[PDB]
Amino acid sequence: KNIDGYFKIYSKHTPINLVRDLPQGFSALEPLVDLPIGINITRFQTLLA
Amino acid sequence: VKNKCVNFNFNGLTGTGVLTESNKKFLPFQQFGRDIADTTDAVRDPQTLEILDITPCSFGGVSVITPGTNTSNQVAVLYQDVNCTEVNVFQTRAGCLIGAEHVNNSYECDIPIGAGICASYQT
Amino acid sequence: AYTNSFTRGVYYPDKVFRSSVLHSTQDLFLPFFSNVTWFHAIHDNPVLPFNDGVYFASTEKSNIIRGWIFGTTLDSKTQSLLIVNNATNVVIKVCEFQFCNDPFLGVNCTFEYVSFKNLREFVFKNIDGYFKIYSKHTPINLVRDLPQGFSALEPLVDLPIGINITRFQTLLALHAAYYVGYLQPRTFLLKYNENGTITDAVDCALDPLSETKCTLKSFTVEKGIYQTSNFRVQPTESIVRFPNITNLCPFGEVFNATRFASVYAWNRKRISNCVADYSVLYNSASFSTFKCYGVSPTKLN
Amino acid sequence: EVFNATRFASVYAWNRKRISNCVADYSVLYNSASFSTFKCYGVSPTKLNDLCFTNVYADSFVIRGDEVRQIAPGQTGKIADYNYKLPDDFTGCVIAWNSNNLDSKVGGNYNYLYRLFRKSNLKPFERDISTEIYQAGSTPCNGVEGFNCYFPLQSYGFQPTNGVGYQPYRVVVLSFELLHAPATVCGPKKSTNLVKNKCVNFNFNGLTGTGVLTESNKKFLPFQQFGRDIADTTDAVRDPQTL
Amino acid sequence: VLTQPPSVSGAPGQRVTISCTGSSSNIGAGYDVHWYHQLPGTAPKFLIYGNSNRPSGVPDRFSGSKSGTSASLAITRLQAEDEADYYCQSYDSSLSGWVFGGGTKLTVL
Amino acid sequence: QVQLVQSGAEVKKAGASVKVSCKASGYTFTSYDINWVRQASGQGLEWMGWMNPISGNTGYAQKFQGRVTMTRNTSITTAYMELSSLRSEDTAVYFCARGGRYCSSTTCYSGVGMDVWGQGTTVTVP
Amino acid sequence: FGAISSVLNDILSRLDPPEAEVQIDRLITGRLQSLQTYVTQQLIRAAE
Amino acid sequence: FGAISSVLNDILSRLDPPEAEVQIDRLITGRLQSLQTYVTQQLIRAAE
Ligand SMILES: *[C@@H]1O[C@H](CO)[C@@H](O)[C@H](O)[C@H]1NC(C)=O
Ligand SMILES: *[C@@H]1O[C@H](CO)[C@@H](O)[C@H](O)[C@H]1NC(C)=O
Ligand SMILES: *[C@@H]1O[C@H](CO)[C@@H](O)[C@H](O)[C@H]1NC(C)=O
Ligand SMILES: *[C@@H]1O[C@H](CO)[C@@H](O)[C@H](O)[C@H]1NC(C)=O
Ligand SMILES: *[C@@H]1O[C@H](CO)[C@@H](O)[C@H](O)[C@H]1NC(C)=O
Ligand SMILES: *[C@@H]1O[C@H](CO)[C@@H](O)[C@H](O)[C@H]1NC(C)=O
Structure with missing residues (x-):
């Protein structure tokens, strides 16, 4: 995300063992690097290899 | 310094209190601590990565035990909830009492002090 | 030589009449039952600190003590007053008089006015240029030292000199018993009577008796428990803990860049890992206007 | 002596003239259109004649036309911090008429002087005649100016040829402190006879109100003026006409 | 003069660090050195003070650097017309307030 | 806006004295320290000392100690370099300096004598 | 209460009316808040 | 309470006295009025 240019x-990297649904359990995201860019962000696209 | 309240300025945050070691496990991005009353509870020393607990030192109002001026001019002072280091000296659960000699014999309460301690004027 | 200053040194903080009412004020008095120095008048005039005032008293029989010089240098380098009474005229001038090698009276002239049995108390001072x-002259039957008793000390004349005094030297008569109490910005429980003479006073920051006296606004306190003030363990020193930053911040870069952006495309230069002194900012006198809205204009460094 | 004066002091050695034993009318000051700025939050300009003051000091000096807001409670500035400090609780009224034609001469009115260097802030209404050389660097300064040695008491130049922003302006602090000292400068109002046992609008030395006026047996001391009750409201007064 | 190329025949653009040798009071502490120039044909109008600090019409080619026991100002872009008289002045502290040397001269052939 | 007038070409006998003038008036002179700098004919310049118009400062240098005093007439602020009991070393062109930094700026930088005075010469020949 | 004087005849006799609304307003919000503490204090005191 | 900060050490280090009196007596008006709500609230609670 980008808020106020930050x-x-x-x-987060967690292991799962389940077959049908995303698992029931709480996992918080922690900041690592705060970055001075100053953009809008509205769309994300997933690429593979 | 430890166990002695001084004027600290940790990264622009000022206050008065003692700086003690803590076991409070900060995440690496997180820097400051808060209380239930959202005042500063702990800080990390920004030079050496150590958790520093902040607690303001012993304080409190002073109250005075004094009989009638028509009876006496002997003086007494009471330091409540102060431990008798930072201040004929008596330490009780209510605090540091200076002026009155501690008596193991028990009498009826005349001037209340706190935590079951009472002062009076007798032989 | 020490003396117990029993009750002397109370004056009028103001000369507005009051009756049967106890007024508390902050003013400069010497403490009651305190330590004051004892002097003799044989063969002593050191220059004592008149930091904010002393109380004078004289046991006199032949009018030997006759004047004072108060000031900050007291050597005609600053404006210093001289007092002489030639049995007919009161003479108080700060004008450039010829003082002797040892200043005595026999047995920058800006202020333009040109002309035992007795205890004498004189307090010459300056508060706000007054x-x-x-x-006060008071009869007694006592010879050993200053008497025990209450004496209101009243103003007489206010003159336009407004002089700095931080240390004072008494004036002798050559061919002085006095007391020095260091005054402090202390609060005082003062008592007025119906005839308007101050009959008693309390230095109430002194002992628990007096602390109860001026928190209960009474000269007689009942037996009981009374909170008077707050005790705080004062900080003995100052500790500063900042990150081990080693780079001078490019504040000068955003002042001295080769080009600046317009308001249509002004920049967000974000700053981390820096040291900001702002002392060079305040030392620079180039600032045409400095309207500093959240934080102090001066107190930022 | 304070308006039509031939000589004005400067900010380093401003005259502090006690004005007493005289009648202060202020009505000719109202009728004068000479004043340009008449600023004070303490007293009002126009409704001042009915008031009688404790003691008034006329602080005479000269500072720039842009510096007229510096003479105010709480204002911070160069001259305000190095030459003349105003307290936050300042009572009194500062008057600044135009000095376009008075405090100026062709070669330059060079007698007005001001401090620019000090290592401490000023006290209110102080009198600093310090003539030491200010030390700019760490080197000791043995009376030798030059590098790291500049003298604080700086002067002005006033010429009619100069611009109106640099033209001399007169600002004078007629400091109207209403303090404890006895009232001596009252308005130009005629007195009336005294009435007892009947409440009447009284205006005694500037203090207004209504009440009954009976004789009292208390021995007010000379220089003792009012009797205040617990509310600091005037309970007794000494008549200034008859003792 | 203090130890520089003291009086040389120089065309305007010679890249000569016309120095000004100062001691620790001058090369390190007296970094506010200013260059007087009594100009040929007028009263001194140096237009070059505080090393590279320039008035209008003065270029940054006069570069002011303190290197060991040596100051510096130079020029560039070799031409013919800059015959002039140069002087370096330093805050000599224990000496007089600010002192020159011998009178550096720039002249062409 | 700095205006500068001084004395002219003169000849004086050895042992005499001069009441010389270095006259600055008509502008904001207060920001400027009217110092004193000389140069010999064909030598480098040399600084005799400073005179400070900012309310009365006095202080000399070593090469003319015992020979010169200074005073300032603060009304119109005339600067002096009083060459009394003159000797051989003052036969040159004598000029004043002008401390160019602005005094209401707190940083004490270098004296910038941007404008330079007319003429002063005490030639001592028989 | 932040006003320059506490006696109302004094504060009215020396303030021009346009800034007197400000000075009187500070004085009366202080006076009325103190009186409000007073009347609530004797409301609970009269309740006691 | 309408002031620009709420930690009084920050206001003391942040504002000069002349505007500090404005924000600070705003803070005092708020923190008093919280205190009289507190003491009248626990005083009616003390009646309870
Ligand atoms: C970023 O987003 C805002 C909102 O959608 C948009 O108006 C703006 O034009 C975008 N930035 C650029 C450079 O187009
Ligand atoms: C910076 O501070 C850290 C504190 O942990 C210390 O270990 C390091 O040596 C310091 N470096 C310098 C250059 O002061
Ligand atoms: C008071 O201080 C003494 C001094 O060491 C200590 O032993 C004691 O535990 C303290 N009292 C309390 C209640 O902590
Ligand atoms: C005060 O004045 C009254 C009035 O004459 C007098 O009778 C009394 O003795 C005086 N002294 C007091 C009350 O101590
Ligand atoms: C008064 O004197 C003391 C010490 O002599 C000095 O620190 C202070 O600045 C003086 N104040 C004034 C107004 O002269
Ligand atoms: C001064 O006041 C007293 C009051 O009775 C009076 O006797 C005297 O006439 C007054 N002076 C003048 C000039 O009227």
């Missing part, structure tokens, strides 16, 4: 990166 | 002559 870009905070949120990251 | 020069108050405080005087």
Whole structure:
């Protein structure tokens, strides 16, 4: 996200073992690097390899 | 410094209190601590990465035990909820009492002090 | 030589009549039952600190003590007053008089006025440019030291000199018993009577008796418990803890860039890992206007 | 002596003239259109004649036309901090008429002087005649000006050829402190006879009100003027005409 | 003069660090050195003070640097017309307030 | 806006004295320290000392100690360099300096004698 | 209460009316809030 | 309470006295009026 020109990166890496749905359990995202860019952000696109 | 309240200015945040070591496990981005009353509870030293608890030192109003001026001019002072280091000296649960000699014999309360301690004027 | 200053040194903070009412004020008095120095008048005039005032008393029989010089240098380098009474005229001038090698009276002339059995108390001072002559003459039957008793000290004449005094030297008569109490900005429980003479006073920051006296607004306090003030463990020193920053911040860069942006595309130069002194900012006198809205204009460094 | 004066002091050695034993009318000051700015939050300009003052000091000096807001409670500035400080609780009224034609001469009115360097802030109404050289650097200054050695008491130049922003302006603090000292400068109003046992609108030395006026047996001391009750309201007065 | 190329025949653009040797009071502490120039044909109008600090019409080619026991000002862009008289002045502290040397001269052939 | 007038070409006998003038008036002179700097004919310049118009400062240099005093007439602020009992070393062109930094700026920078005075010469020949 | 004087005849006799609304307003919000503490204090005191 | 900060150490370090009196007596008006709501509230609670 970008609020007031501050870009905070949120990251989380957790293991799962489930078959049908996203699991029931709470996981918070922590800031790591705050970044001075100053943009709008409204659309995200997923790429693969 | 530790266990002695002084004028600290931790990264622009000022106050009066003692700086003690804490076990309060900060996340690396997080820097300051808060209380239920959202005042500053802990800070990290920005030079050496250590959790510093902040607690303002012993304070409180002073109350005075004094009989009638038509009876006496002997003086007494009471320091409530102050431990008898930071201040014929008596320490009780109510605080540091200076002026009255502690008596193991018990009498009826005349001038109340606190935590079951009472002062009076007798031989 | 020390003395217990029993009750002396009470004057009028103001000369507005009051009756059977106890007024509390902050003013400069010497403390009651305190330590004051004892002097003799044989063969002593050191320059004592008149930091904000002293109380004078004289056991006199032949009018030897006759004047004073008060000031900050007291050597005609500053404006200093001289007092002489030639049995017919009162003479108080700060004008450039010829003082002796040892200043005595025999047995920058801006202020344009040109002309035992007895205790004498004189307090010459300056508060806000007023020069108050405080005087009282009192009979006694006592020889050993200053008497025990209450004496209101009233103003007489206010003159336009307005002089700095931080340390004073008494004036002798050559061919002085006095007392020095350091006054402090203390609060005082004062009592007026129906005839308008101040009959008693309390330095109420002194002992628990007096602290109860001026928190209960009475000269007689009942037996009981009374909160008077607050005790706080004062900080003995100042600790500063800031990050180990080692780079001078480019504040000068956003002042001295080769080009500046317009209001259509002004920039967001975001700052981290810096040291800001602002002392160079305040030392620069280039500021045409400095309207500093959230934080103090001066107190920012 | 304070308006039609031939000589005005400066901000470093401004005259503090006690004005007493005289009658202060202010009506000719109202009728005068000479004043340009008449600023004070303490007293009002126009409704002042009915008031009788404690003691009034006329602080005479000269400062710039842009510096007229510096003579105010709480204002911070160069001259305000190095030459003349006004307290936050300042009572009194500062008057600044135009001095386009008075405090100026062709070669430059060079007798008005002001401090520019001090290591401390000023007290209100103080009199600093310090003639030491201010130390700018760390080097000791043995009376030798030059590098790290400049003298604080700076002067002005006033010429009629100069611009109106640099033209001399007169600002005078007629400091109307209503303090404890006895009232001596009253308005130009005629007195009336005294009435007892009948309440009447009284205006005694500027203090207005209504009440009954009976004789009292208290021995007010000379220089003792009012008797105040617990409310600091005037309970007794000494008649200034008859003791 | 203090130790520089003291009086040389120089065309306007010679890249000569016309120095001004000062001690620790001058090369380090007296960094406010200013260059007087009594100009040929007028009263001194140096137009060059505080090293590279310039008035209008003065270029940054006069570069002011303190290197060891040596000050500096130079020029660029070799031409013919800049015959002039140069002087360096330093705050000499224990000496007089600000002192020159011998009178640096720039002249062409 | 700095205006500068001084004395002219003169000849004086050895041992005499001069009541010389260095006259600045008509502008904001107060920001400027009217100092004193000389140069010999064909030598580098040399600074005799300062005279401070800012309310009465006095202080000399070493090369003319014992020979010169200074006073200032603060009404119109005339500057002096009183060459009394003159010697061989004052036969040159004598000029004043002018401390160019602005005094209501707190930073004490260098004296910038941007404008330079007319003429002063005490030639001592028989 | 932030006004320059506390006696109302004094504050009215020396303030011009346009700034007197400000000075009187500070004085009466202070006076009325103190009187409000007073009347609530004797309301609960009269309740006691 | 309409002031620009709420930690009084920050206001003391942040404002000069002349505008500090404006924000500070705003803060005092708010923090008093919270205190008389507190003491009348616990005083009616003390009646309870
Ligand atoms: C970023 O987003 C805002 C809102 O959608 C838009 O108006 C703006 O034009 C965008 N930025 C640019 C550079 O177009
Ligand atoms: C900076 O501060 C840290 C504190 O942990 C210290 O270890 C380091 O040596 C310091 N570096 C310098 C250059 O002062
Ligand atoms: C008071 O101080 C003494 C001094 O060491 C200490 O032993 C004691 O535990 C303190 N009292 C309390 C209640 O902490
Ligand atoms: C005060 O004055 C009255 C009035 O004459 C007098 O009778 C009394 O003795 C005086 N002294 C007092 C009350 O101590
Ligand atoms: C009064 O004298 C003291 C010490 O001599 C000095 O610190 C202070 O600045 C003086 N105040 C005035 C107004 O002269
Ligand atoms: C002064 O006041 C007293 C009051 O009775 C009176 O006797 C005297 O006439 C007054 N002076 C003049 C000039 O009227």
